[PDB]
Amino acid sequence: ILLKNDVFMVDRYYDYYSNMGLNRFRWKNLPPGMESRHIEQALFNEGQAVFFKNTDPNEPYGFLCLPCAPSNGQNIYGDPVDFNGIGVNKYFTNLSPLNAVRILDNDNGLAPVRHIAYYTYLMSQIEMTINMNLDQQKFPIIIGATQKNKLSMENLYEKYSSFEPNILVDEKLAQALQEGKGFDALNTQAPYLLDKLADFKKTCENELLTFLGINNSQITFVLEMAYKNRLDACKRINEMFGLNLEVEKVVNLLEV
Amino acid sequence: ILLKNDVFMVDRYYDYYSNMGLNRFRWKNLPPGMESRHIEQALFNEGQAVFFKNTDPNEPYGFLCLPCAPSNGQNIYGDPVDFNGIGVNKYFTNLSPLNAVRILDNDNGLAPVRHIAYYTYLMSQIEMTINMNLDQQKFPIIIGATQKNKLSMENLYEKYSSFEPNILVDEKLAQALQEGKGFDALNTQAPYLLDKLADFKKTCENELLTFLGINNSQITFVLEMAYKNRLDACKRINEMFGLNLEVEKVVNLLEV
Amino acid sequence: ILLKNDVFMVDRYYDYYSNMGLNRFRWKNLPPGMESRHIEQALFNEGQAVFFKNTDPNEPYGFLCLPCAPSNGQNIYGDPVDFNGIGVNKYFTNLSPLNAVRILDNDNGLAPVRHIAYYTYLMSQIEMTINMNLDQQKFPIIIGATQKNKLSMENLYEKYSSFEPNILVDEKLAQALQEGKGFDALNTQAPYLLDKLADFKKTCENELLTFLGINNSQITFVLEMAYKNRLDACKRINEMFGLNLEVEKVVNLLEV
């Protein structure tokens, strides 16, 4: 960071809105060595996850919950016939509806990160536009002059000014004989936008929070669909494995 | 995604509004191996569905509910004489009103996806226009100059500016003798639209939710026609097959 | 400081907003020779910290809490396998989840200083723009004249004025025969911005305080995520070492 006319703007918004998106739900009884955050990040980043019993003795886990890639074969309705669990430096070959449970964030399996990635691009472009418009307010007019005229204006300003004048030598103005004034002012005044751009950023933030279900009828309905899909997977895991998982909405982070 | 001057905008809106449209109704008693979502996606995507007893022993189902294509023959009133059930990698030849039930979303069999497909195209064009208008605010004026004049303006800006000036060499300006100033400013200032475009997107969203019946007299009446057609098919299925299906509106996703 | 047309503006804002950011939380029971401020500055500057028992006899400490750099190896979920504690003139090699606790400010480990560094750059540019716009109000018009005309205007002003006129000799105006008036006024009037720039600074301050969780649903939710991560590390330290640490929000600095 700290360069001229740039900032590492993406990270500030991407991580900040990811912290919110990762904290909608909590899973409260789990197999050994597994945390609520692991299920929720697979749902957040891929939109779908697969829960299964481990068989590879090299990995120190009884059960895994990982992002899912379905195989290309399907039944009459279009349900995929087999599931693939993707891990860091690992890949689990064709698990099935007979021996694993596939969990969805929402019924199309659209990942919540895809909303965040569009809006972080947009908020970084609003920031750049704020900064360019602010810098442009420093220069409402520029004066072209002859070299001796330029010198005489710097003396007029050095009397009462705290800056240097916005004046330059124009080579055509200095060269030409006959007509042409020896001073000419070009109006470079940009419109003031800073008030409007801060409002539009706040409008974009509320749109993002609505697509996440976080913020009112559509907001509640978005989070209800997200909760229903988790309740329905939770009873399937309890029925296939006997594990007594439960899942809840986060109305507050701390319990008491 | 992540390319310059483009986004994969269609998916974000198409899947998000499909999740809402697929959750208006719930079917609560069903034959073995069949889910409420299977009936509702055939009604959502085709506007009409056919419910029938399976005869093909290769398929692991007692009853199927699939999108319907009617045959071109009809009675005096214009009711189709036979029905065809369309499956993934499958096609069931001429079923009839004597041995199957055809279900409608609404009396013309207009598919709810046809509303979503128009409005996702429109919302993707509003997004592109927002992004183009935002980028255009960075450039209210451009300056044409001679090559030595351009150099002298870059020194004036490097004193107090955090960016580079919007200045270029004009080859006609640099070439020509006699008159012509050696700096000329062309006004490229676009109108500010971002506030208005965010309002129009919200206006388009409410129109889509009204055509789906989801959002007040017309909204309720749209969902009442949609429910009535399902109740009327539900008693027909119970009368032709003895299955005790029931169907309800989703006022909330979870029951308790 | 005290130079013409500059100020040491960064420090005034950076230290002032750092004092606020360092005072969100308090840690109330601690090992010998360690202070609440030491944990909180490692969380504030790096976003993550490592708590461990000292082994190097040259250092006068039983336990240390320092900014953390993870090693590049990770499990299936992407948790880092080892931790490195970074000190002033010191570096502690690969500590592990078996013998140390890693503390987060927030789940992505985004440092709170990264918000402050962007907004202090912005507030220093608003200040410079205020000062340039104020200086520009002194010069709404400049007059070009012949040398004898300039002298005659200084006598007109010395009668009733408390300043000197904004007048200079124009060498083209003085040189040329025939047409051209012997006085010409160039309009240099800038727009008045000081009222608008003070408003935008206040808008930027509220945005910074929201990203810190300090200032209402998003503000509370930001501080709740920040507290939850500290409570969860606090019980881990008490379980690995038997130290009875506790952590609290600062609703007031003094207790009574």
Author numbering:
A (entry chain B), B (entry chain A), C (entry chain C): 28 to 242, 261 to 301
Article, verbatim:
The Portal Protein (PP) complex is a central component of Caudovirales virions in the process of self-assembly of phages. The PP has multiple functions: (1) as a nucleation point for capsid formation; (2) as part of the motor for loading the genome into the capsid; (3) as a head-full sensor; and (4) as a conduit for genome translocation. All portal protein primary structures are characterised by a common fold comprising four conserved domains: The capsid-facing C-terminal crown, the interior wing and stem, and the tail-facing clip domains. Using cryoEM, we determined the structures of two portal proteins: GA1 gp10, and phiCPV4 gp17, which are phages of the Salasmaviridae and Guelinviridae families respectively. Both GA1 gp10 and phiCPV4 gp17 PPs have the canonical fold and domain organisation found in the portal protein phi29 gp10.
